[PDB]
Design an enzyme around this catalytic site. Sequence first.
Site, mmCIF file in Angstrom:
data_model
loop_
_atom_site.group_PDB
_atom_site.id
_atom_site.type_symbol
_atom_site.label_atom_id
_atom_site.label_comp_id
_atom_site.label_asym_id
_atom_site.label_seq_id
_atom_site.Cartn_x
_atom_site.Cartn_y
_atom_site.Cartn_z
ATOM 1 C CD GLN A 260 31.957 37.143 21.687
ATOM 2 O OE1 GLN A 260 32.320 35.824 21.548
ATOM 3 N NE2 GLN A 260 30.605 37.320 21.478
ATOM 4 C CG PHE A 261 28.863 40.001 17.482
ATOM 5 C CD1 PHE A 261 29.375 41.352 16.778
ATOM 6 C CD2 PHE A 261 27.840 40.048 18.072
ATOM 7 C CE1 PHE A 261 28.569 41.970 16.042
ATOM 8 C CE2 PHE A 261 26.525 40.694 17.619
ATOM 9 C CZ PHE A 261 27.077 41.736 16.793
ATOM 10 C CG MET B 255 24.264 37.341 20.704
ATOM 11 S SD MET B 255 25.027 38.774 20.847
ATOM 12 C CE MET B 255 26.808 38.263 21.443
ATOM 13 C CB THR C 186 30.302 35.325 17.954
ATOM 14 O OG1 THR C 186 29.472 36.224 18.750
ATOM 15 C CG2 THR C 186 31.714 36.229 17.762
ATOM 16 C CD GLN C 187 29.546 35.314 12.176
ATOM 17 O OE1 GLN C 187 29.751 36.306 12.698
ATOM 18 N NE2 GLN C 187 28.696 35.492 11.053
#
Lengths: 222, 226, 204, 211, 195, 195, 196, 196, 233
Positions: free
Chosen positions: A1-2, I107, I1-2
């Site tokens: 997860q970022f 994000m 997000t990736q």
Amino acid sequence: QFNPYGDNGGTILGIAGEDFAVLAGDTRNITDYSINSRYEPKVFDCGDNIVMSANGFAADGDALVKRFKNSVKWYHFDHNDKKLSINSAARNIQHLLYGKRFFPYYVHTIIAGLDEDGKGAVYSFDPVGSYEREQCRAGGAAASLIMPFLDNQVNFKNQYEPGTNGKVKKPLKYLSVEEVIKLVRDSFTSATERHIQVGDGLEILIVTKDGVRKEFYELKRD
Amino acid sequence: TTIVGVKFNNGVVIAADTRSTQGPIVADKNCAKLHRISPKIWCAGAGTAADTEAVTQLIGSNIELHSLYTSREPRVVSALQMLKQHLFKYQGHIGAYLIVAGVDPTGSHLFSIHAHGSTDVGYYLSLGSGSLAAMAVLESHWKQDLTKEEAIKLASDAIQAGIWNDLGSGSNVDVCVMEIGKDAEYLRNYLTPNVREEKQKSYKFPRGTTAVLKESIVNICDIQEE
Amino acid sequence: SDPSSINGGIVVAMTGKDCVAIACDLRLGSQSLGVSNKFEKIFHYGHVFLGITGLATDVTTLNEMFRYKTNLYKLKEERAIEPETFTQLVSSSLYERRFGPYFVGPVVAGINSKSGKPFIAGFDLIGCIDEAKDFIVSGTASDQLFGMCESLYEPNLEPEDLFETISQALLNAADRDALSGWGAVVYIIKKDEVVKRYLKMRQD
Amino acid sequence: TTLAFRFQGGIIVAVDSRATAGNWVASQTVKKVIEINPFLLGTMAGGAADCQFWETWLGSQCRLHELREKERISVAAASKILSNLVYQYKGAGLSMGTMICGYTRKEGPTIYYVDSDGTRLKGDIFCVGSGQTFAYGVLDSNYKWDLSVEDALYLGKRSILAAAHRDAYSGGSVNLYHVTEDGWIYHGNHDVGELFWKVKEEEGSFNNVIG
Amino acid sequence: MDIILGIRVQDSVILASSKAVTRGISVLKDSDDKTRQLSPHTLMSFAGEAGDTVQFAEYIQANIQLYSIREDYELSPQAVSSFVRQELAKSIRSRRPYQVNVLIGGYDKKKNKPELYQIDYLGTKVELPYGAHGYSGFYTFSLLDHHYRPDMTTEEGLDLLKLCVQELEKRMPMDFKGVIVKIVDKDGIRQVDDF
Amino acid sequence: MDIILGIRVQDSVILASSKAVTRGISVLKDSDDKTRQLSPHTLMSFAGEAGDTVQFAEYIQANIQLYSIREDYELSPQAVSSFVRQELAKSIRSRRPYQVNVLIGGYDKKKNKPELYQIDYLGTKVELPYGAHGYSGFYTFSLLDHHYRPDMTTEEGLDLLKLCVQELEKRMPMDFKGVIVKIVDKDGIRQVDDF
Amino acid sequence: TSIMAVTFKDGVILGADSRTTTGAYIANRVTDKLTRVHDKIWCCRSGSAADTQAIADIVQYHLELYTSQYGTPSTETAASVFKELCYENKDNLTAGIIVAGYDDKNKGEVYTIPLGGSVHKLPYAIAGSGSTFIYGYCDKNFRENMSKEETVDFIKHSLSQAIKWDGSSGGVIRMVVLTAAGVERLIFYPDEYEQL
Amino acid sequence: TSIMAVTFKDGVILGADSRTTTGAYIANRVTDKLTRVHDKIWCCRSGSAADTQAIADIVQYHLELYTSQYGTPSTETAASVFKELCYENKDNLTAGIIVAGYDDKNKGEVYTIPLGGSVHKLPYAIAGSGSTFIYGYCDKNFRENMSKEETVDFIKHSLSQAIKWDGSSGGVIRMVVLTAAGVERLIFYPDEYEQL
Amino acid sequence: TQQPIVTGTSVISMKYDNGVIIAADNLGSYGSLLRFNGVERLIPVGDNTVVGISGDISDMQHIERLLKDLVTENAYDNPLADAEEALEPSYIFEYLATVMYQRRSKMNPLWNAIIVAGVQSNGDQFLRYVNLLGVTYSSPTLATGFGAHMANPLLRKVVDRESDIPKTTVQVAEEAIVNAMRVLYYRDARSSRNFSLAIIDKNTGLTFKKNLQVENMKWDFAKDIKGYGTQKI
Ligand SMILES: [Mg+2]
Ligand SMILES: [Mg+2]
Ligand SMILES: [Mg+2]
Ligand SMILES: [Mg+2]
Ligand SMILES: [Mg+2]
Ligand SMILES: [Mg+2]
Ligand SMILES: [Mg+2]
């Protein structure tokens, strides 16, 4: 997860004198156990005799300083080149910070300058914009190493007059800018010894009625 | 932590930095990371410091008893085998990462050992958070048939790369040189490139500064005669 | 929930000229609640002094354990244990609980009765020895103590100057820690006298 | 620790000065009474920013109200502007527990407890924070409607002192205010360190503590 | 269980302990006595996890009674409290620890002094002029800190205790059904039968 | 909040609602009135999540007062309770539902009959001779099932209610600080001022 | 890791790359993955280095004691000892081992013991993370009864490709030849095999 | 799935197996994975069948509209349209596509668009779960400027091996040849390619 | 997000007396599979700037198109597009940094670490870093990924501080850079032998070298290494 946040280390320190103020920071920028740069300035002259540092996550810190500098520019445009006073700058920064209350700038902000009576001023902010005027404030990695020392050596906490055995406090004399700078250098010299993220260089911005001056000192590079 | 080992002509040299940390705080600025397993078998440890000390002492103790039992000088392969089998059994829970170097009647040796019990052989090795900085120097300057002086030079340069570039490492270089047919020479604080500059101010207090409620003498002496 | 900061408290030790000092706060709490202001954390076995911070049940257990062991040591050796020897014993004892440790930060201070040399040492909860020439710190305000000691300390202080230095290091560290304070004690130790001083400090 | 109570002479507001991050004492000089305007006070508990930001915003709404209506806003109306606002944000993570204090002609001395989950309670005595239970004990056993202003101020000071002593996360100094119909009056900053010894001696309390 | 308080005055120790026993949704009992006499001049009150409280207390009681018979002698309150502490310190690293907090109020006949020990389930022991477990201290200590004197009589101790209990009944959300109060002094242990 | 009860007797509806307001560890207030008058002959008591209770109740009150002014007419208790139910049924599929349970006691001036409606936060509505929300029914319904008569007077309703509250004060673990009691009949709404 | 063993006319040859990684860092670029458990019984190891070293040390001990009592063990016997350790401790091991050896009765033999501790006797075997990329190549190019030079070429070309595509494989190609004539060690450097 | 496309002297050839699985069940054993987006621009699809069909249908639409307005699109243009869809919707797609086409200016071209929506122009490309097993084989055997017959053989042997080792690949080998001369479809059955 | 899929490893760079050098290998990895072997990760912008990119390759290809579109746009209605109003390294960097920070703030980052190397109009060296978080910094040497851990220590021995820059020739700097690339090839499992190197010099302009290889590799000592402890054969 970022994870949108990071930690670039750094330690900053603002002290308000009688007719001056200093804002100091180390010049080391880190991630994890690596050094990104040994000289990445982190305390900035923002115009109108105001200096600023937003310590913590450097992307957010840079964004905030950039937005505040811009807000100074537009204050001049919108209000007939009126000088932005330090108390007004402080309230303004609260609104910049609180505007991202639910996705905060991950930084501890300090600004320094002179108030409207020419007296030294320091303001300190939490990441979402609560603030207060203070005499003394360290921020960042080694803040917990520095503040107790400042409590003792600037405010004379726990020091009493010899002979009175605790009956008479050591009286709170005013420090010169040379004195303050000695305490800043010893603060950072000590923090450098015991904190791995503190080192490389120390840049001090000094604000008086004559403007903003800089001083630089090497710190240990290990 | 930065630790390296380097083989040379007639021996082997190990080196280490001297900073131990608790998270980002420097607990000890002049730590001793070079441990003696036996007079001519020394090791340097990274990871959990209690474990590197404890495992080193335990095998050192058992190596000494083995030595007395067999009337022979201890071998590096014995220290290695005893270390790895102890560590393996504890499945990595003993957090000891070691470089083990020494000389014995069989020759000169250099091994590394990882907390789960795997070992390796080489002419140059590095371990710890500073190991990538150290290994960059070793990969740049190592060659076959180094002299003693060249190996000491290379080993301490490699530690320095860790000291300056790894936040986990700092302070001083310790070195230990093990040469065939000689006493092992331990060179504590071989390099000292980080002495603190003098402070701006002395912080010695006037006597009577601190407020006191009570004084008393503390009896540290045993019950007295008469 | 973190066992090493449920009860709070600090210990610091320093070497000076032919002397050592060891000091501690007097607080015991249950998290935010202050429970006792007379919980001393420094003990002694003959001329060897031991300060222990951390989980209070373990502080008491370890004091009792080291009294036990130093008493037997004395009966058998026919002499008082020395600081260097006791330091190894603390380390051995802590490491024997490697995988179910005592949640403590011990600190040893004393003077070797034969050599006259001042000695101090600190330990992590699992027995790793930090033997410092200058000072050792432990407890919930250890960052603050490192900051104070690193700037206030200078080598070879006379006993009466060392007292001021260590007292000021403790007091100002404790005042920046919620879980430390409520009183403080300082031991000044020389080869054949030890003086104990209770300090006056803020009670919040 | 923060408290406010109503009595014959108006309202006493008393607060400690300490902010902590975990065990680290970040500040002992925090200003926990926010001066909304010269007639209205709010107390800071929960999030420092949420309290500061929204209660100085409240001051702006109060000022606009009185410009438009040519009359002092009631404490009822002022407190409800704040509670309605935070209620809009409910679930987003605002943290606030505050006493909105004022003294108007129509209402008399008035206190509303307002809270980030939307609670708005009028009452005579409130106490909020990690040290609140200690303050309540002193308040409950000494409170009367007919305290003089002087005794009311002391009681507020003594209650925060009780909290500062026992609660690890309370201390630094005590700030006192007296709210009258003609505005609030500041009654100074009192270092807890010095106050504790002074009270112990003059009162004979805290016999458990050696001085 | 819930509230247990203790106060050591001039010549006695007073323990006050709530009467309620609550199994989740219903108050099953309102006359429960959360205390065991360990020896003629030593009383122990207790609170914590169901079952373990009474099991621990009766186990301690059996042991002190055994010692008393073996030696024809009453252990000092200090000695009893050290024995209890060691049992809890050993228990905390057990397979299943006793989740029990205690106050020990004893009158030491050799020193002629009342003594109050507070010990939590970890084996954290402290000797105090007054003490409590759980949340009881949060509501009562500011009152005790104010009014306590080391030379109080037993009746002044009881009056200060009444005030503590009144504050608990005011500000505490749970109905603990009053307290049973017991006094430990040179003549032994007795129960104040109206409170 | 906690206890809310209602009983519909011969000629009136009686609502009893606890006075405590508890913020976790402290009882902040012991005189809280958990009710709003919606119209001269309709009263609504409420309990549930903090903030939402009073917000919902004042919102309903504002709406019924608006209707009353627009039409110069008082909606029947049935009509008001249907309006309230629809608001809660719509709210339960909202982004953030009102977590509020209510009793509506009204005197229908057209039929000359008292009426009691119980509505939970889902919009589950039922008309009852007596009702409650939360755990209150678990302690009181066995008493109401026994003694209730549809021809009881107001005073007999109050006496049966006293008995219900006594059982709650006995067996319930939480101290709810007594109840405020209000009567709704042909003359409007009044508060019984000693209970 | 890329490892294989190949039977041929005069015996069997084992091959391996020399890379061991911790994540993306190459902890050792000159590893010896060809491990001797008896004079003419060797194995190539893949999986946990700690586990496979522990296992091989135990097998070496077992075959040393077997030899003392019963003479030279067969390659099958060695495979059986490996298997016993891998199968019975399957919950606590990550080990994939190829066993290769030369008898005078049986000549060259290869056994592979994959993750679950099953055993499979094969003309040749491939394993390690790098082997996935050469299933097609090896299946097309393997012949029975190749000469020594052909088998060296087959292994060299095979591991060439495994190294090319697998980031976890690299360094030098090591080989060990097991025949009636003895035990021969070979090594091939990047500048040779990268140009194939 | 095993798919590849190979440029040669006269153009480009696409190849694929015909197996699609739901877990271990073969839901379709005669799938056509060679999909036409323009007359002489085709693609082989791997990943989610729903996604790659949706993408290809959209690309076909785009190139139909492009053709109406601007004439025949280049193979690069087709690859760019694929890439735009795969890159911009990368969070919601599981698609690995090889694009192959013939121009008269550019002749045979091959582009591979892997999972993240990057584009890579290559002489030949392999993809699908089966491709892992033939990286070594394909790298050793591919030459530039092969004849049609050689390229058919290369693909047939390559996919032979992918099918042999990959449980998710199987059935018939389908191919599509794209040259100046037209569009030719080939099919090879198990009894042919299994004996190679 | 990736999550990054096809990725490029280290970019390394340093300042010297008259300019800057930057280098990066030609590999695009797919996890541990070394999938693509001719990927250019140094992208020149005009004749004064080279942008070196690591991390996700699909995002790199996107950034490369942004830069190309920047050049097109700067030329619009700009008679001085190839003179005083050409793009500077500092304009290109600030733009990329703005984009990176905005993307993290939504994000939805561009999953890269980027080093912009060039020479300004006034001859000043430009070297600055930005990554997926919008974090930026400058130093006489800069490196991403493994390069930060292994290249920087080596490059910092040549230029350790600002005052070392004028003493460092292009020959010394290039040789330092080339050695660092060899070291990374030894020790980084996701590196390749093949790389590109670019020099931006204030006198000789932009020199762009492709198809460089790591050479002078030491492997011979491997023949002597046997077993993992006790094995002799
Ligand atoms: Mg440092
Ligand atoms: Mg394992
Ligand atoms: Mg404190
Ligand atoms: Mg306090
Ligand atoms: Mg405290
Ligand atoms: Mg306790
Ligand atoms: Mg490879």
